[PDB]
Structure formats: structure tokens, C-alpha cells
């Protein structure tokens, strides 16, 4: 089984290729990592296995979901440390995903009920609704477009959050540059209508992700930095006129960062949408262009993951929904055992046990 051959992810020696995908679960009450998160990540931890956390706030303005953890206060760092410690005691490697939602927020999630920030003043359309703290759905508002000084401030929030992650003991961080959140609001020409040096051309639209990645690389080192993008996922009105072109432009900037650093990033992580053959060729084209480790994600099964590694299409395969419902997903894939079905009703609810740690083991 090629999913169970070992893999060197830079200085991290993985024993198998099954990765916990980052997943917002909303159990981090009032943005504090809770003991429940330790139980949940401990259940899914394996010796030599890689875990990526749910998206994690980099600043008081970065959230657009309730009860998502932060890593920008020293209190948050203190609580994360306890979670990292129980994961490392099972021999897993764990990265913290650093997440800013940009325009995908609401007054209820912002300090002083201020407007969310973005590359432009265009809001998400009424085809999308935001989950509110009371479990109903709300309207996305008009964001505020930020200038070049404030862009540098947001880059510094990424930098400080990455340093905080290392202080908590994380092995590395992942930059969340996908799914129509802040970075993707600069990448996608369906959102970025700027006329300054962050808008227009592919080089200009790539400037923000390049500045973010360079900042976290200088702070903690390239081999502790993973990058996640999704050029072909249209979520939250995040379309590009040429997804393959945009994706290859991002890869170009990552290859160039690696060569200036004399080091490789931890990985490039790309989620696909589910023309099945065109999307497959889009993924293989990004992988072939990127000089390093490639994680694929989005709709993978046991059989689709074995085939991705066997055919050279990916080095690592991350799983989301099957890892919600199967704490021992790795062992179930190894044994080719039945899989529990996930209950979508409790994906984002607040109970520390129900729908979170009570899916059974084999
Ligand atoms: C409940 C839920 C929350 C998610 N939260 C995040 C997130 O916080 N960050 C992110 O980059 N992707 C997030 N994702 C996407 C997953 O990381 C992953 O790409 C997707 O689940 C993989 O597809 P699969 O579920 O078919 O395995 C989330 C997915 C789900 C179902
Ligand atoms: Cl997401």
C-alpha cells in the first residue's frame, strides 16, 4: 500500500501519507483552544502521522466563524501548548493553519462591530450566507478595502502568529490561501478589482501571498511553512478567469522564494473541486511545476488516495470529512476496514463531545 510508505517532509520523517486536513469545528469557545480540541486531535494522532489544525485566527479581525481558536494572544498560546503536547506524545507532527477570512465575516464577529477588511469594497453576493453564533444564517456585509500600510500590518499579524505557533510547540504552520478568504480575495481576478500595485496583472495579484509567505519563512524557516491554495474552487464568489494560469503563477512565486532562501517549503497543499479529467490535469500540472512536496485534498477516498500516490500525482493525501467520523482513519485505511459516516449537523456545533469526540474506534 503506497499510502504506507514513509515520506520525508523536509526534516519531518512521516511513516505514512494519510494527512488530517484542516477543519473548522467551532469547539474553541470564545477563541480559546479548549481541552476538547486536545482530546479530538489526540484521537486522530498516529506515530509519524501529519495533522493540520482547523483554521486559526491571526488577529482580532480575522474571524468569520464562531468559537474558532486564535493564536495571537499569549493566553491562546498557553492553551495550544497543552494540545500540542498530547499530540507529540503520540508521535505525530502537527502544523497550525493560520487563517484570515477577509470579507467573509459579519459585524457580530468584528471588534466594535466594524466592517470586515478585504482587497476591495465588493461584498460576497446574496448567493452565500454566513453562519451566525445562534445557529442561523446572516448576510455578508460590504467590506472595507485596505491600503498598502494596512496590508503590511496584516503581514505582520501572520509573522507574529507564526512565531507564536512555534512558541506553543507546533512543528510548523500552514498559510490558508484558499476558498475565497483574505489571500484568495487578492489572488482571484473575480474579486480583486484594485488598480494599485496589488491589483490587475498576475504579478500584482500574487504580491500579497508572496509577502505573507516571505514573512513567515524569514521568521520560522521555510521547512516549517506549508502553503494552501485553491485556484479552481469558486466558494464565496471567488472565481478567476484562468485558474490554471493563476495557479501556475503562484507556484512560480513559491519556487522563487525557495531559491532565494536556499531551502524548500514544507509543502504545497491544493484542494480540488469535484470535468473530472480537466481538474485532474490541473492538479498534476501544479504538482509538476512545483519544486517540492505536494498534498492533494478534496473528495479523496481510500482508493483515490492510493492511486494518487502510486501514479506520482501527490506525495501526501489529506482527508477531511472521513477524518471527522473516523478517529482511527489511518488504521481503517491501512486495514481496508469499514468507515463511519459523518453527521453534517454537528460539524460546526459547540458541544465538546457530541459529534466531535464520540465517533467510535474500530
Ligand atoms: C467542516 C469542515 C471544515 C473545514 N474547515 C477548513 C478550514 O478551516 N481550513 C481549510 O483550509 N479547509 C477547511 N475545510 C476543507 C478541508 O480541509 C478539506 O480540504 C476537505 O474536507 C477535503 O475533502 P473531503 O472532506 O472530501 O476529504 C473544511 C472542511 C469541512 C468539511
Ligand atoms: Cl476553508
Author numbering: 10 to 283, 297 to 384
Original paper wording:
Variant Y364P was produced to test whether residue Y364 is required for homodimerization, as proposed previously. Proline was chosen because other well-studied ene-reductases, such as morphinone reductase, contain a proline at the corresponding position to Y364. Like the other variants, the monomeric form of Y364P is almost identical to the wild-type structure (RMSDCα = 0.21 Å) and misses nearly the entire loop L6 due to disorder. The sulfate binding site is identical to that in the wild-type homodimer, except for the absence of Y364. At the highest tested concentration (20 mg/ml), all samples, except for R283D, which was not completely soluble at this concentration, exhibited a hydrodynamic diameter of around 10 nm, agreeing well with the calculated values of 9.18–9.54 nm for the respective dimer. Interestingly, variant Y364P, which, because of the lack of Y364, was not expected to dimerize readily, showed a clear tendency for dimerization with increasing concentration. All enzymes (wild type and three variants) could be crystallized in their monomeric and dimeric forms, even variant Y364P, which lacks the putative phosphorylation target Y364.
